[PDB]
Amino acid sequence: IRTLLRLVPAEKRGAVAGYAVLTLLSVLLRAVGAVLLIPLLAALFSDTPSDAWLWLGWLTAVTLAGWVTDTNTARLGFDLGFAVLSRTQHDMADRLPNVAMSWFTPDNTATARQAIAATGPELAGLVVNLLTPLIGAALLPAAIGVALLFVSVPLGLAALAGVAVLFGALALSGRLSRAADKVAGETNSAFTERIIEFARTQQALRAARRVEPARSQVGSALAAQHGAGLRLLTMQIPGQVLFSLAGQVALIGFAGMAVWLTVRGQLGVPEAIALIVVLVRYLEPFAAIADLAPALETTRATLNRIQAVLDAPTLPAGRRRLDRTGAAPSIEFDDVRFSYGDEVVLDGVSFTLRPGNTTAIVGPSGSGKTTILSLIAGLQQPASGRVLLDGVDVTTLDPEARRAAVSVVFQHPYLFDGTLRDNVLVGDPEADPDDVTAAMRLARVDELLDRLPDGDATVVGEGGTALSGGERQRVSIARALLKPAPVLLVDEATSALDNANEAAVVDALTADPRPRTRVIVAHRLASIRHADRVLFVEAGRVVEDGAIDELLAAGGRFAQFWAQ
């Protein structure tokens, strides 16, 4: 195969050659071991059987050297399979946090999930279970043919004729079944994605009665997945028939040329009898290739998914760094433009944030507020224009410095499955417990510790599913505040919290003792308390901006926003 030699490490290319040399050597030893029965039995049946010892000794030397070769190529294939497994997986794990957000379409996300889901033993045992026996079965009929040229040239050519039939059948079997095998993979992938939606969206589906398989989209996907599954089973009938014809055609050719030589005296009777066993050894790779041929197309799709992930467009980056790690940077946008596909979110927003102060952003739903925060935090990047941290373009900044210079509170607080403390410690794992306790206290997560039975060991579910809407929001705020980065971004921290908890969190977002440049995306007039500056964003541009009192006195769009 051609894609596996690309995914293989540059370190292991020495080991790849040792694999290739030994797998060829095993094929030659297996063919020579098969063909060594011809002179062995020819001498065994003769009037002097003692001459059989020479070929038996050669047979023992050839077969024991097979075991050493096949054991060594198995160890090498095991290493190369796991070296490819570790290498490809770590490259997908390193690349995916750098991939552009636009790459995560519903199809690509399924591809990434499937590619990551190939970490199981099936991909690890690629070389041992597929390529070693595929190469062995593809070349052993050819090797047995070449080994028979020493016995009789016309017979060796007959076997090579049967080899050409084999490779023809192998090429055609893949050709016929490829159209149906693609559809089987597409339908099976969609079925997986719909099971995940089915389990994640159980609440909404059940209320809408789209949960039973007769009416559910997962139930339809199971029907299409079954239709394509059965079609593939039928469309693989030509492949099995064609291999069976190839195995029979080669049997007639090899057996015919053996009897044509035997009657004419060019081959003795014992050589013909030995050739029956060599024919059987020669015919086994025909059936084995039929068993391995279906696996070749699945693995080709699997490596195509992994290669799709690795070829994904990473985000631009440089190697710059901020002047100071912990000092408050100045954030500014300079004709930043952005667009999700054809839809345009920002049309040249331009603003400047003084370092250490707190600023607020407000505007109608879908205006672009979370887009502005994502550009600040580096999740997105502009189609054109620049976002500067302390005068340093985000695009030219090192990934590690860019990641460490921002902590954000997301609109839809996602917590990873695991305990409550683990999600808090994600902000800064090295932090001592005194900083962790201070982070929780500021976020009113201490109230969860009192009320909840397991305290900080509370096992959150998938996402923040096993916590309240406000409880997961508070855990997210504690995670964000724990990170010591000098910029803090708040995206609807007031959405899911009662009036008492909202006031405590709003007070604590500004009462944090570290110096940071704060951007607040709030909802209420009271949620923007202690805000030095406010930016009104509407239709993708900052239409109005100023202080709370100044904008209220002006009676502009800001005042009309609260009037409903």
């Binding site: 994605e193 009416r215 999740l379």
Partner: protein, 562 residues
């Protein structure tokens, strides 16, 4: 396994047939070599040509017959499995449609996908090839070895040596990797969970920790370290079994035990013919079952995991056996035993009455809404809609009676129309636009490229406020007697929130409504405001009455102004 045998009851007769058919097929596949042996004996004897032709052509045809029968049986037997997997995936999706939602939350979407797809797919070997291989590995070696035993015992007892070494290799491989086989599906679920959260929680990982510090990668390394420890001794034994059972190993050890007998006056070279022709044939039968023992183990465990879900408590619809009235009577609920979440709540919702359920975060208000929808079953007391117990209503009757918005704007992978029309998929575009216009999201959908067919896949096409307005659009189109709003318009700005609430008031002026909202100033006009604090009804009354009472609601209201 009772949990597996109970599941594979429907395929009793397809499996018994496959066992018998493989018994005949292997005998048919061994028949040519018995003929080719007879062809060989007569060649030394120089018999008449037509006799040799008859043995030659019958042997070649029986090879064709055996390949056709073995091929045809694998076509049928694969199709039988594909039909059982389709049915069994149907049974699972029907079961999970009935379980309480506690099953889903404590389990995760990764474990369900393993259940529906990977566990059913794991049964493929157990149905399609386990009993064929088991019968083939029994009769073809037994037939071959017994025939070879009659031919010559000396070379026959030497054939035991590859066989016994193979048995020890497979027994040692099985006991060694058995523990790893049990731990394997749990590891796959955990990494399935970590892979899912890694893709879904990408904005978090991109900022808090990055690639190296990610808990996905730390688990990824641990999984690969589990795989290496599992697969090194396993693959290390697999190739040892391949080497021992190969035709070349049988052919070499036959010649080693025969050639010294041929050279001495102890065995004729003609009696070697059965062994060289048949003795090398039965290795691939033993090698099939040896590689299949792990497939059976994953199959039996997958069957046990599937049947364990198929006997789960089902949220049954019992046969015990005012319009729009919902009554909660002494209702108590616990997500897990030992912690009370709801404590003896008693509340009555009547037609044409807007009820506001407010209180501290984590007080249980969304849990009450979940009990009205019957995602979970109350641990005490009863819930009755229009005077009929919810546990007696069927899901179609229940969900035709109540409509829901659930605070988590989940959207299904499909068009916006396939999300707005989720309740009534047959509903026309004229209703879908009318629902969206009333939910105040039609302006957004018009500006999309595909219009009302634009796809809403993973993390696409909508923001948080816009995702909710789709969900309210869905609830409007369902058009049920009762409506339950769990923090609807939480992300909606005041200009849009007023328009949406005005639409809901217009649509539900004679419908039971249960508004849940933390913003107390948006529920100033509920005819009754229920205060839920720590899972109990601490006070009930109008807005003005609760302010005068000076209790929990007065504190929350005063604390709202900051």
């Amino acid at each position: 396994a009772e949990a597996g045998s109970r599941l594979l009851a429907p395929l009793k007769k397809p499996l018994i047939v496959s066992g018998v058919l493989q018994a005949l097929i292997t005998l048919i596949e061994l028949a040519p070599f018995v003929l080719l042996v007879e062809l060989a004996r007569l060649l030394l004897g120089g018999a008449e040509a037509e006799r040799l032709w008859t043995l030659g052509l019958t042997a070649v045809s029986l090879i064709g017959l055996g390949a056709v029968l073995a091929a045809a049986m694998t076509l049928w037997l694969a199709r039988v499995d594909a039909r059982f997997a389709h049915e069994l995936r149907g049974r699972l999706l029907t079961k999970l449609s009935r379980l309480p939602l506690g099953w889903f939350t404590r389990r995760g979407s990764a474990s369900t996908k393993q259940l529906v797809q990977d566990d059913t797919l794991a049964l493929a070997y157990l149905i399609t090839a386990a009993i064929p291989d088991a019968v083939a590995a029994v009769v073809a070696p037994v037939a071959v070895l017994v025939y070879l035993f009659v031919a010559d015992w000396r070379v026959a007892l030497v054939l035991f040596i590859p066989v016994l070494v193979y048995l020890v290799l497979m027994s040692v491989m099985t006991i060694q990797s058995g523990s790893k086989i049990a731990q394997a599906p749990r590891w796959a679920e955990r990494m399935g969970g970590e892979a899912g959260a890694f893709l879904e929680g990408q904005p978090v990982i991109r900022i808090f920790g990055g690639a190296a510090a990610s808990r996905f990668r730390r688990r990824l390394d641990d999984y690969i370290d589990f795989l290496v420890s599992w697969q090194r001794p396993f693959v290390g034994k697999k190739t040892l079994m391949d080497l021992v059972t190969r035709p070349a190993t049988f052919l070499w050890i036959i010649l080693v035990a025969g050639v010294p007998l041929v050279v001495t006056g102890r065995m004729d070279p003609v009696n070697l013919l059965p062994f060289l022709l048949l003795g090398t044939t039965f290795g691939a039968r033993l090698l099939g079952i040896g590689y299949g023992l792990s497939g059976i183990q994953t199959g039996m465990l997958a069957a046990r995991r599937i049947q364990t879900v198929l006997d789960e408590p089902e949220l049954v619809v019992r046969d015990r056996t005012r319009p729009g009235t919902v009554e909660l009577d002494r209702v108590s609920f616990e997500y897990r035993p030992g912690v009370p979440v709801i404590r003896d709540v008693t509340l009555t919702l009547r037609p044409g009455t807007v009820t506001a359920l407010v209180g501290p975060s984590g007080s249980g208000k969304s849990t009450l809404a979940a009990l009205v929808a019957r995602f979970h079953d109350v641990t005490q007391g009863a819930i009755r809609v229009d005077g009929r117990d919810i546990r007696t209503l069927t899901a179609d009757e229940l969900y035709r009676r109540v409509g829901f918005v659930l605070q988590d704007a989940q959207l299904v992978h499909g068009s916006v129309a396939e999300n707005i029309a989720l309740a009534e998929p047959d509903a026309g575009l004229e209703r879908i636009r009318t629902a969206a216009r009333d939910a105040q999201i039609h302006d957004r959908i018009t500006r999309m490229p595909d219009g009302y067919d634009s796809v809403l896949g993973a993390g696409s096409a909508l923001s948080g406020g816009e995702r909710q307005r789709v969900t309210i659009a869905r609830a409007i189109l369902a058009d049920t007697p009762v409506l339950v709003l769990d923090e609807a318009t939480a992300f909606a700005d005041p200009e849009s929130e007023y328009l949406v609430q005005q639409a809901i008031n217009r649509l539900t002026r004679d419908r039971t409504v249960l508004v849940i909202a933390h913003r107390l100033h948006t529920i100033t006009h509920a005819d009754q405001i229920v205060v839920l604090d720590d899972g109990r009804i601490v006070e009930v009354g109008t807005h003005d009455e609760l302010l005068a009472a000076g209790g929990r609601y007065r504190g929350l209201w005063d604390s709202g102004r900051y």
